[PDB]
Write a protein that binds this ligand. Structure first.
Ligand SMILES: C[C@@H](Cn1ncnn1)Nc1ncc2cc(Oc3ccc(F)cc3F)c(=O)n(C)c2n1
Length: 346
């Protein structure tokens, strides 16, 4: 049956949640909503509860809400943020106006833990292994993160990791900002229709930073960042130039003085040669030629962690809704069906 709900004001907004969730405390901002820590008395888990802000105020918002719920409901993997619960105080579709999403409460994001700090090779191995393990799963469902960065990697005290905010402005991408430093050049500069390996570029940037304690490509703007990238990996050859479908972007790239790829062993001085090799395979300008998550897990760098029988893939994920044009109430009804049909994990 329907649980008993109780009301509380937290972020100058009234939160209405089932009794099972106790000791609500603000954590901060989440994607498209605010997040509270809580204790789930039913499972004994410390949980993060996100209340979506105005989830059905427009078509964009309504579809966005449906999108996030569909994504979270699908993801069932140790290294990916999944859905422990989803609820609404609404008793019917006509009353339906709020959506609350529940997942594991994590200790900190990777950024807050590692900033300015050089990690030991074993710690890097374990962290990157988990990211790749989660990404293999995400990619197998034909989902792309698109925005992978340290702040979207949630980690506990024992370094257990989960990927947050997968599959989801111009101002926040401007200037000397971490929001752009981990982005593949093809997505940063709209070169072409990009693939799953945009995420692998991001993993390369994250891995380098864990190994050195320094941002790999701390560009002051898009152009400065491109220059930093091209200095390391070399200017594109004729082969990649043809794949840049944007005539304007292709034309600009051609104006740059050619540079050869640098020696990664001279860039990452002292690093495990296996780590250097993997970075070389991740940080390839031509996305067609980048290592995949599945391939990277089999790389000798992860010898102590790799297990082909314990690196699962996802069930098929139907995202035909993405190409669908619907009204607010139609997206709302689809979302409502997904809320009501939710079955909690074991
Ligand atoms: C104390 C911080 C340290 N931290 N870890 C990662 N980021 N910040 N712990 C923590 N735990 C979990 C989350 C979950 C978030 O999104 C959700 C996703 C799906 C849901 F069903 C519910 C969510 F709330 C989120 O936005 N944040 C900021 C979180 N923060």
């Amino acid at each position: 049956e329907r649980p008993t709900f109780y009301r509380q004001e937290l972020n100058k907004t009234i939160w209405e949640v089932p009794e099972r969730y106790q000791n609500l405390s603000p954590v901060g901002s989440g994607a498209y909503g605010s997040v509270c820590a809580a204790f789930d008395t039913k499972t004994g888990l410390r949980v993060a509860v996100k209340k979506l802000s105005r989830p059905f105020q427009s078509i964009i918002h309504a579809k966005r809400t449906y999108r996030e719920l569909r994504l979270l409901k699908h993801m069932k993997h140790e290294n990916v943020i999944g859905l422990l619960d989803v609820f609404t105080p609404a008793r019917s579709l006509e009353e339906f106006n709020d959506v609350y999403l529940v997942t594991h409460l994590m200790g900190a994001d990777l950024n807050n833990i590692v900033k300015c700090q050089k990690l030991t090779d074993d710690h890097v191995q374990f962290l990157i292994y988990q990211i790749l393990r989660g990404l293999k799963y995400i990619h197998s469902a034909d989902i792309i993160h698109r925005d992978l960065k340290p702040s979207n990697l949630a980690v506990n005290e024992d370094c257990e990791l989960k990927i947050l905010d997968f599959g989801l402005t111009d101002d926040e991408m401007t200037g000397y900002v971490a929001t752009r430093w981990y982005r593949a050049p093809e997505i940063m500069l709209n070169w072409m229709h990009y693939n799953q390996t945009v995420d692998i570029w991001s993993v390369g940037c994250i891995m380098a930073e864990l190994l050195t304690g320094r941002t790999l490509f701390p560009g002051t703007d898009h152009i400065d960042q491109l220059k930093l990238i091209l200095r390391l990996v070399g200017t594109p050859g004729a082969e990649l130039l043809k794949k840049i479908s944007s005539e304007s972007a292709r034309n600009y790239i051609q104006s740059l003085t050619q540079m050869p790829k640098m020696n990664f062993a001279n860039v990452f001085i002292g690093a495990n040669p296996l780590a250097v090799d993997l970075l070389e395979k991740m940080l390839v300008l031509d996305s067609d030629k980048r290592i995949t998550a599945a391939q990277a897990l089999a790389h000798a760098y992860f010898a102590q962690y790799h297990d082909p029988d314990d690196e699962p893939v996802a069930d098929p994920y139907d995202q035909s809704f993405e190409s669908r044009d619907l009204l607010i109430d139609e997206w709302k009804s689809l979302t409502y069906d997904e809320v009501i049909s939710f079955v909690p994990p074991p």
